[PDB]
Amino acid sequence: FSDACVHHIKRRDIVLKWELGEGAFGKVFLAECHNLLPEQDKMLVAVKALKEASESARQDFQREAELLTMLQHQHIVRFFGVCTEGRPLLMVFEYMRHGDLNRFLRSHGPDAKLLAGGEDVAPGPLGLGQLLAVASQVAAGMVYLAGLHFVHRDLATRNCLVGQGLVVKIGDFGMSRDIYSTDYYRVGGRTMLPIRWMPPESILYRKFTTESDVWSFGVVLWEIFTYGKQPWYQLSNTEAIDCITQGRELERPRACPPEVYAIMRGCWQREPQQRHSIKDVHARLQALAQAPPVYLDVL
Ligand SMILES: Cn1cc(-c2n[nH]c3ccc(NC(=O)c4ccc(NC(=O)Nc5cc(C(F)(F)F)ccc5F)cc4C(F)(F)F)cc23)cn1
Ligand SMILES: [Cl-]
């Protein structure tokens, strides 16, 4: 009865405007959705239209909508429900106007100037305060999921979305975008591993736990303070496996203060149980995010 878990939207309430993205299993549109939120006769949504591989796409669709409905929470991608009346099957999401956090970081990097400012974000490179706010929110999402004993397995800035006001939410695009093909190592039967985000016990023993998500988060932090650089960008995939398995650590970013770099290092303890808790990591980044300018100045 996945049917009964998920919210449903009338097809006539959705008006497609133009495509946002396209993959093997469907197209994503920006759309107007009517009579979805009480005080909005009309709001923008992102709609995924399922390109069908028949019984398996239908089942994965229902499983994914059920899961997303269960996990709804402040720093998780907001899912509004499905449209199963006719084909194509549609999934309806909140529209996140800045797109994915990796792209957002790269367009506010250390070269940005006055032009890169906007309604939402100052010109130039994101400042320490905004970098920390981004990190705090993503870690909050991972506290919630760890609270539910849910393991992500592909936590990365490319899988987080940034909305108006720099609200950041975690999602899972499911290895679907050509621009991030480089972030995955292709093994048997087009299996894709995001090795650069994986801890040693994942690479060596094929284990991924909540503690492997805290290591992945540490790489997310590094991505954030490098403005979206790929971890181990100077290395091939196999060199990256060698460096990770043999204990090599990502270098402190220029924009990263030593206190935040200590948070990353705590995520990258070699033995999973020696890693800090994500709750503790979140608490430290929140404390820093909320700190007065006097304090942040001297970091
Ligand atoms: C400028 N711009 C704005 C946007 C934009 N705004 N909002 C958007 C919503 C979707 C997409 N695109 C996607 O592909 C897309 C992205 C994510 C999801 N599902 C997903 O995360 N599931 C999920 C999450 C979790 C976790 F992480 F929560 F624990 C655990 C398990 C899970 F299964 C599905 C799609 C799908 F559409 F394929 F369905 C783009 C936009 C695009 N460009
Ligand atoms: Cl992807």
Side-chain angles (χ1 to χ4, degrees):
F1 287 106
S2 206
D3 220 24
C5 310
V6 168
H7 288 47
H8 296 250
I9 297 153
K10 278 295 260 262
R11 189 162 304 246
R12 50 289 317 291
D13 286 332
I14 295 160
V15 183
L16 308 176
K17 298 163 61 64
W18 46 71
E19 185 177 74
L20 289 182
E22 157 147 32
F25 298 68
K27 302 135 272 282
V28 182
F29 295 87
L30 181 74
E32 235 169 58
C33 195
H34 296 93
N35 306 306
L36 184 90
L37 282 196
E39 293 220 296
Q40 284 267 263
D41 305 333
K42 339 158 191 206
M43 41 177 323
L44 294 182
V45 292
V47 181
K48 197 182 93 233
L50 181 105
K51 223 202 281 172
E52 292 150 292
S54 181
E55 181 60 4
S56 204
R58 235 296 199 170
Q59 191 172 16
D60 295 324
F61 166 113
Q62 337 177 353
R63 172 169 352 121
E64 174 168 25
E66 216 177 350
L67 188 46
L68 279 151
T69 303
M70 275 162 44
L71 307 187
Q72 295 297 284
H73 196 263
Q74 195 162 58
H75 291 288
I76 305 298
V77 52
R78 222 201 307 272
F79 173 65
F80 289 120
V82 297
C83 176
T84 46
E85 83 197 30
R87 274 172 225 207
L89 312 177
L90 308 174
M91 298 174 94
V92 181
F93 294 90
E94 178 186 27
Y95 170 71
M96 295 297 269
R97 90 210 281 265
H98 292 295
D100 82 55
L101 174 58
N102 186 260
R103 235 193 275 281
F104 176 77
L105 287 162
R106 297 198 194 263
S107 51
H108 295 86
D111 285 304
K113 281 332 287 183
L114 254 172
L115 266 77
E119 196 168 59
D120 267 334
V121 53
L126 308 169
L128 175 55
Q130 321 186 258
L131 292 175
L132 289 157
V134 170
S136 191
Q137 300 178 68
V138 174
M142 305 286 327
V143 167
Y144 173 72
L145 293 180
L148 299 174
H149 315 287
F150 174 85
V151 178
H152 190 295
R153 294 181 241 264
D154 193 14
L155 185 75
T157 63
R158 65 181 168 283
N159 276 326
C160 304
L161 288 177
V162 187
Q164 162 135 62
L166 306 200
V167 177
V168 177
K169 305 179 174 185
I170 297 170
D172 187 9
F173 278 67
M175 308 100 156
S176 79
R177 291 161 299 184
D178 284 320
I179 179 90
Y180 302 118
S181 53
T182 168
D183 288 340
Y184 300 90
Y185 180 51
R186 318 274 201 251
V187 306
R190 201 39 42 85
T191 282
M192 315 231 303
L193 296 180
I195 59 191
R196 296 156 193 273
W197 286 257
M198 285 157 74
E201 80 274 14
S202 297
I203 291 178
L204 291 172
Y205 318 140
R206 278 91 164 149
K207 266 126 185 193
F208 206 96
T209 69
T210 47
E211 295 74 41
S212 69
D213 272 330
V214 314
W215 172 291
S216 270
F217 177 77
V219 177
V220 164
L221 208 32
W222 185 96
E223 284 187 276
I224 288 156
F225 280 86
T226 70
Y227 291 100
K229 266 183 227 62
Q230 182 194 64
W232 300 115
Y233 68 94
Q234 70 281 23
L235 301 183
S236 74
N237 289 323
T238 63
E239 294 164 337
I241 284 150
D242 293 341
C243 287
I244 295 163
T245 54
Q246 295 322 301
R248 186 87 101 70
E249 247 173 16
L250 294 163
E251 39 283 36
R252 190 177 53 102
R254 159 161 253 280
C256 181
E259 299 82 0
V260 174
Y261 190 61
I263 287 173
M264 309 178 189
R265 271 193 298 110
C267 295
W268 300 333
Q269 292 318 304
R270 183 73 160 59
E271 313 284 332
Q273 328 301 332
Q274 291 300 93
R275 281 162 206 160
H276 294 232
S277 166
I278 191 73
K279 267 230 208 273
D280 266 330
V281 168
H282 174 248
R284 259 170 256 129
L285 299 157
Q286 213 207 314
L288 290 174
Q290 294 295 91
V294 167
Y295 187 105
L296 284 188
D297 175 24
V298 297
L299 286 207

